[PDB]
């Protein structure tokens, strides 16, 4: 009952290039990938669900929460008006998976998942929130859709395994699901949002360059230099369409340009994207970046670099030793050799600014630091 392939359902209109059979369970993740000795060598084992079928199984699983959520919003159990499902899509490598008795042969894995984020119902010109995932980053609600033993950096296999999933996902973007819940047929409209991709996988599936590139942002076309001089005024200009377009520009070279000029033109989109993603940022990295900058500012303000341009390695090392000792003394803050989250959390406080001001000569710089913090 709890596995994909148990309940019946219908898509209106029927999904493009997706079977209408509802009794499909676990399917081979290669999706009929050729395996003869002549073909490309297939070195991976993978299994997956059919994306629509998995969406049905997940919905039936949360049926009781949907009915209870409609009740808690003063709506009717038997109401069937169109529900909307915001599905968060994810994909990550799982590093090493090997079991070993030394001569450790690594074995990497890729997990392709989805997370029902919220379900709403149109009751008026209003969208009533009948379900919202309480712990959206938990492993409890991250429904596995495809498991594969392959390297996330192995583009040929990544695209061969994932392309059928993406195709079913696309097909569902243009249809409505009818499914029987508590005796009443209901209809569901889906909104897939690929936010579960860390930067490396974003860049890989959206055609961008590797993280060391000058084009540092996956939301805009800024270079590292541009982003350092222009600090605040950028806008979210990249998109899956633009990126498809830029790959085509890169491929056809329509204005017969040199590689540097062509690369400048296409803003680093030098391979064909194959997954539409929605790159974001986590609350953690905002704090981390700010704290790294404030830490460096603390060390330099202890050394009065505003007043002295040059300083040897020894002078800066003694500045950092002073700051670390003083934070350990007055703020009870252990020194760390590596950036991390809770050092940031504990260091980004006005109390720490008073502490570090105890080590700064001029108080105009006290004012500056207090206002920056």
């Amino acid at each position: 009952v709890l596995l994909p392939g148990y309940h019946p359902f219908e898509w209106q209109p029927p999904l493009k290039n997706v079977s209408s059979r509802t009794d499909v369970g676990i399917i081979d993740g290669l999706s009929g990938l050729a395996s003869s000795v002549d073909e490309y060598p297939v070195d991976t084992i993978a299994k997956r669900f059919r994306y629509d079928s998995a969406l049905v199984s997940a919905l039936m699983d949360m049926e009781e929460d949907i009915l209870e959520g409609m009740r808690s919003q003063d709506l009717d159990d038997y109401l069937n008006g169109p529900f909307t499902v915001v599905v968060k899509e994810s994909c990550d490598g799982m590093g090493d998976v090997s079991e070993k008795h030394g001569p450790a042969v690594p074995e990497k894995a890729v997990r392709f998942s989805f997370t029902v984020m919220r379900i709403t119902i149109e009751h008026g010109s209003q969208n009533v929130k009948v379900f919202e995932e309480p712990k959206p980053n938990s492993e409890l609600c991250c429904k596995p859709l495809c498991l594969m033993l392959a390297d996330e950096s192995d583009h040929e296999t990544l695209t061969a395994i994932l392309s059928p999933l993406i195709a079913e996902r696309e097909a569902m973007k243009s249809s409505e699901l009818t499914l029987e819940m508590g005796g009443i047929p209901r209809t569901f409209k889906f909104i897939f949002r690929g936010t579960g991709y860390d930067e490396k996988l974003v860049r890989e599936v959206e055609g961008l360059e590797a993280s060391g590139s000058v084009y540092i942002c996956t939301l805009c076309d800024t270079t590292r230099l541009e982003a350092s001089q222009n600090l605040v005024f950028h806008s979210i200009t990249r998109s899956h369409a633009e990126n498809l377009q830029r790959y085509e520009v890169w491929r056809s070279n329509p204005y017969h340009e040199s590689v540097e000029e062509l690369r400048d033109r296409v803003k680093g989109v030098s391979a064909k994207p194959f997954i539409e993603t929605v790159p974001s940022i986590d609350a953690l990295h905002c704090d981390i970046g700010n704290a790294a900058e404030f830490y460096k500012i603390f060390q330099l303000e202890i050394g009065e670099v505003y007043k002295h341009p040059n300083a040897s390695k020894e002078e800066r090392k003694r500045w950092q030793a002073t700051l670390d000792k003083h934070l350990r003394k007055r703020m009870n803050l252990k020194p760390i050799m590596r950036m991390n989250g809770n050092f940031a959390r504990k260091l980004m406080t006005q109390e720490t600014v008073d502490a570090v001001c105890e080590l700064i000569p001029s108080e105009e710089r006290h004012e500056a630091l207090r206002e920056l913090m």
Partner: protein, 340 residues
């Protein structure tokens, strides 16, 4: 035929099954890298030089007017009198290309080649995107024409379903005449070619192309047939005729090299799914005859004898570049050069 081990430089990972080698004025080049091209070599084309059994892959650059073709696995390639024709193949995203690319030497300054890669548009009876198919050039009545045959492709957009999204089928065995001068293609159905064929060998002499071995998916047979396809080009009305000739080898994915004019060697490939073709063949060509003779098998090492898969390409100078996978501790691939 002397077998020799080869060591590889830092970018050995680029070499994968389905790669291609092209020879320009004795210099060998490598195309079809694994993964999309990186900042180290944006073209995906490399100078492929073996000095004292050590292989170095050094990036090659494109002219200002070039296409930057995507890396292609198992494309159809052939040599044109000097330029190289690449048609079809699989891209790093597993899409099949219908395009045609032409590689030529744009500038050779101080032994540092610049390439021109130009995309040729094709109209008429364009062949569906393919891999594992053959293309060669024939010359008839002072005229040059391309002949393309075989291969595999995904299911048509009507029948393709996500559960078997990657399933492949042999293409219909239609011979395609392709005029590069005009960019047009014409399809010719022949009664002698009833079944589809992939990973076969093709030898082009004058107005003829011979088709050897290959593998047919529907029957799952590696047929021991030899097909001669003759093309006459009287004015603007071409004509194509096929003849079956007994004595054909049964081999898929074999490699072909030219040892002398009108004599070629066929090494490697598969006789059965689990068996490898360890023997070698010598083909001698006459203006109207072809002869296939067994030759002395080379001194294979135990690693080659016991490998299930091997892959390779023709370097041009009667020498093949071969590769087999190995496990244990160590390398992903082990490469050899077989000379003739």
């Amino acid at each position: 035929m002397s077998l020799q081990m080869v060591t590889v430089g830092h970018n050995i990972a680029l070499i994968q099954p389905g790669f291609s080698l092209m020879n320009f004025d004795g210099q060998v080049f490598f195309f079809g890298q694994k993964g999309w091209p990186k900042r180290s070599c944006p073209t995906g084309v490399f100078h492929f030089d073996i000095k004292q059994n050590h292989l170095k892959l050094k990036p090659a650059i494109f002219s200002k007017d070039s296409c930057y073709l995507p890396p292609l696995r198992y494309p159809a390639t052939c040599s044109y009198k000097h330029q190289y024709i690449i048609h079809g193949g699989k891209t790093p995203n597993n899409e099949l290309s219908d395009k045609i690319y032409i590689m030529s030497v744009a500038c050779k300054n101080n032994k540092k080649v610049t390439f021109r890669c130009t995309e040729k548009d094709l109209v008429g009876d364009v062949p569906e995107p393919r891999y594992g198919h053959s293309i060669d050039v024939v010359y008839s009545r002072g005229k040059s024409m391309g002949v393309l045959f075989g291969g595999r492709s995904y299911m048509p957009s009507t029948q393709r379903t996500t559960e078997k999204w990657n399933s492949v089928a042999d293409c219909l065995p239609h011979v395609f005449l392709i005029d590069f001068e005009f960019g047009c293609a014409t399809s010719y159905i022949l009664p002698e070619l009833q079944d589809g064929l992939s990973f076969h060998v093709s030898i082009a002499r004058n107005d003829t192309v011979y088709i050897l071995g290959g593998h047919s998916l529907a029957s799952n047979i590696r047929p021991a047939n030899l097909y001669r396809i003759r093309v006459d080009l009287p004015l603007g009305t071409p004509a194509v005729n096929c003849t079956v000739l007994p004595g054909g080898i049964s081999v898929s994915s074999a490699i072909l090299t030219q040892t002398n004019n009108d004599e070629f060697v066929i090494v490697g490939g598969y006789q059965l799914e689990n068996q490898k073709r360890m023997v070698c063949s010598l083909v001698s060509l006459g203006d109207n005859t072809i002869e296939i003779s067994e030759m002395e098998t080379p001194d294979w090492t135990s690693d080659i004898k016991h490998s299930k898969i091997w892959f390779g390409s023709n370097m041009g100078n009667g020498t093949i570049f071969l590769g087999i996978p190995g496990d244990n501790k160590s390398e992903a691939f082990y490469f050899y050069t077989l000379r003739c």
